[PDB]
Amino acid sequence: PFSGLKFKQNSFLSTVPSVTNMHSMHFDARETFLGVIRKALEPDTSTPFPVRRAFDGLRAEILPNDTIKSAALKAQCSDIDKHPELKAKMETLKEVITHHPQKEKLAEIALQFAREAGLTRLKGETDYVLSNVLDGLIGDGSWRAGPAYESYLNKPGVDRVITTVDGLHMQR
Amino acid sequence: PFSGLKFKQNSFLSTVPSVTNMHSMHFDARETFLGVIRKALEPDTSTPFPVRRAFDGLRAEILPNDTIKSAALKAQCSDIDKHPELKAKMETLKEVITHHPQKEKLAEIALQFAREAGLTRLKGETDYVLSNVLDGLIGDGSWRAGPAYESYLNKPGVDRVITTVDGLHMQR
Amino acid sequence: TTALVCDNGSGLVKAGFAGDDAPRAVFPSIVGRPRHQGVMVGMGQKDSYVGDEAQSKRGILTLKYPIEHGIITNWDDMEKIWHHTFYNELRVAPEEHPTLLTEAPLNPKANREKMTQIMFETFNVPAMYVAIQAVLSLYASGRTTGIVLDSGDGVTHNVPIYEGYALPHAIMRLDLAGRDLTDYLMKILTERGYSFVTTAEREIVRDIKEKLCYVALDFENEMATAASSSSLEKSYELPDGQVITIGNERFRCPETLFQPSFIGMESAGIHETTYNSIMKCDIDIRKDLYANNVMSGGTTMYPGIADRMQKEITALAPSTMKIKIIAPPERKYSVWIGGSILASLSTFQQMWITKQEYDEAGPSIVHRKCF
Amino acid sequence: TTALVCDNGSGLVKAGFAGDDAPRAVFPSIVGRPRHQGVMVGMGQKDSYVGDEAQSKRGILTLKYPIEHGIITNWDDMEKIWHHTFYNELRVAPEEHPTLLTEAPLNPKANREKMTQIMFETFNVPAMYVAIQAVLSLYASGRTTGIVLDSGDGVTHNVPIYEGYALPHAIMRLDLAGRDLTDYLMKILTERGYSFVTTAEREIVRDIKEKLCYVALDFENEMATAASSSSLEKSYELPDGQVITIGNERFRCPETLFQPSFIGMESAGIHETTYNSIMKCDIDIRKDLYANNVMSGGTTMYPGIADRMQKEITALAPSTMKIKIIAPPERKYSVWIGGSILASLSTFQQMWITKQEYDEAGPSIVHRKCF
């Protein structure tokens, strides 16, 4: 359907935010992540113009830039089954991601958002737009489990250490 | 002696080396500069045949291309008194360099060679051919004093400016 | 209806109305995003900053230029800047205002095609037209003959035009412009212990270049003079109060325009590029082009550039010919003024690309109706 | 006469004789001074301690590094360091040996000027020379083509060389090296209740990092594993008998090399820096530069770093290119080995800066006979 589509080697690297901002108070994990994949999915000039024009329309309805366009997509996607048109339009976007030459690099980027920002907080009840994009990146479907975190409550190796400063002030 | 001699406009511009290569570890500035000088002195077709042949012979005997010929000539240029009539041809050549229409550009090229490559290293004990060429290019003899380099040790305008990166890892 | 002449450049966005003398809005073409983690409730809510805001808050932002070498590489940021320069700066509604744009010669076709598609679909403009930057710069100078050397932040291109005719086989281009000069200045400022690596510090170095650099009449004479005394040294004030001092770096940075081998480029300097450009024109035209060198652009505002260019070309040109550099005081805004003049001519009104023509052929149509 | 090679790096000082296979003396580049008031008379206390002596008595001293980010800040301390290197470790007389030096590329020129002046006045060396560390690293590996990534204690820089020709415009430099990793580990160790604030305790953190850190092949995969079980945990014994245990800190501390944004730097990771440096060279020499990556320096001794570098570069480079990363087992001393090789070549003996030359030219001669 969309044969003959090629992408730039490495162009999405300039869209990933800093790890710090990934801990900011109002960082939008979903909106930015869809931006990273979209900049990756921009067709290269080497694609024939009839093929290029077809894909650009696909990216214009599922991964838009304007906030209102993404907001309207988030609203009607809750009961997505009532719109069979989008189900096929979303699937043809998923199969393109699976064959992306930089899929391995994009797979790491998704996990970096999940652990640092919290992209996979819902861990199974996402917007179904973020679902297929993650499903396209990693096909094992293991991101719904959630990012494993290390708990310092138990302390198997708790080592109360009196260093230089701590030795000037103690009790018992 | 060479009434009617003419040249091209920018025949010598293709021979001037790059500034980056002009700092090469094994760059022989003398051979490059003499080659530039010779290429600038190539007679044109419009010059009458006897004058053209005489000037070609003069250039051949005074500014050869073979490395062995240049070395052999430089061997006996240390003492010009022991080889009379060599100054007469050398003076005749040095006369026509001053009448070159591209005297200013050639002088600038020589000055660039001095500062960048180190053309005037002996600055007073240089070989006869190079010294005579430089005297022909610039009539004031100001190339014997050296390129007047700069020392960053005067410490005049340093402030130990702590910039963004230098702010992170600093002591006291 | 009034036309909106909007010039997009690598460094600055120059926008305004048709028929005016000066642009109404001039803001840098940068987009900034925060790089530190916010902590205060409320406050930081914007994912991106565009224009002067990204220049004011550059302490906490990473600045990316959507245009490099005169070719758009980040289309989302370009669309953002276009939206800003229409809804927040000129206070206009693009729906009711034809727009004019500019593009350097020898650009990829896909760039202009996309530009047309964006203009007709994301903005719904009444009409548009893309004109060669050098061609417009000639309208503002009030001439029909002369060679134009338009150099700014992206490219340094030469377009000779004689008697309302452009000779396209003599058009030349060089990806050596203000941004490359700023990078070279950043590289050489480390000789004195000043380090600038971040984007904001790149902007600071750019300001230093704009406020302290000049083109020397004799590079050798100038380097020798700078190395003999401290006459050429000057002081600049960093935004945090620290003071820096630069010596020979003031004129070495713009020398890259005349010796591209400083930054590792094999290509020839601008004087030799101009000389080759005229020599590709017919022998009967060269005399008029020797005597109408018209310069325009930010990189053409270095003090003393005209004298050095005249000296070099006269060194290359034949003796009997006359060399005359024309450097009007408003050459930073020559392209915009020329565009405003072109959009305000009666005869130009048949050269707009309207939506009806756009729908029939598609963006492609732009190659057919535009030079 | 016998030549001396002295690699005065930021962290350690390597010294020895030319023509040898290994350095003879290697001691830390630290100068320590007492911070407590003395009470017992008769033993005698020196005002300062240099090298290993300052390490042994570090419980009562404050250790100051004379070299920071590759630039000599304190000159008196460096004079004492050279005094030690010449009279207490090599047991030589400087006047009877030509000494060689190393310097990181793109450093301030005042640094090498003062180095030359100090060696020609305080120590009266008969001859000297300053080389670029990456070039010596390439000599040591017996290659004439390849890109060198020397990452020491203060500076991490890339220098591409092809067929004995370097490309200065492609040289990168990044002030992110072992000391910043030590500082980051000192900050991260506070998450487990371990607090190290004093200069003596900085050395302990450095030893922990040397003996327990490694670079993970997949960062997110490694973090998950250490959060799932206790396989990656290891325990280190403090000098006073207490025991500490570090979990995912083992591979988080070195990850700053590939993600500088952890410590607040905007630069790209060293893999991206290497790719950018390769891409700035000519198109005809990229195939050879891809297949001759040479790493050297202390910071390139983390286990598994070679595999991570290969994976990242392959992810960045085109598929059809072959990526080969060369990590000789003796790469910690590659710079000194190269310096020993260069000083023992016959053709190099004409390139020394003799005292006579320095006297005639002045400290400025370092900018001509040296690259």
Ligand SMILES: Nc1ncnc2c1ncn2[C@@H]1O[C@H](COP(=O)(O)OP(=O)(O)O)[C@@H](O)[C@H]1O
């Ligand atoms: N007075 C000046 N002196 C030196 N450089 C300048 C001056 N004014 C502007 N510039 C530089 O010119 C560059 C581009 O200016 P401009 O010609 O407006 O670019 P564009 O044509 O892309 O809009 C800027 O990067 C700026 O640094």
Ligand SMILES: Nc1ncnc2c1ncn2[C@@H]1O[C@H](COP(=O)(O)OP(=O)(O)O)[C@@H](O)[C@H]1O
């Ligand atoms: N086995 C190791 N694992 C990790 N880091 C090491 C190892 N050995 C040395 N280092 C690091 O190397 C740095 C010094 O190495 P070196 O390149 O000799 O520094 P310099 O070049 O300044 O002399 C030290 O700061 C230390 O952190």
Ligand SMILES: [Mg+2]
């Ligand atoms: Mg312009």
Ligand SMILES: [Mg+2]
């Ligand atoms: Mg070193």
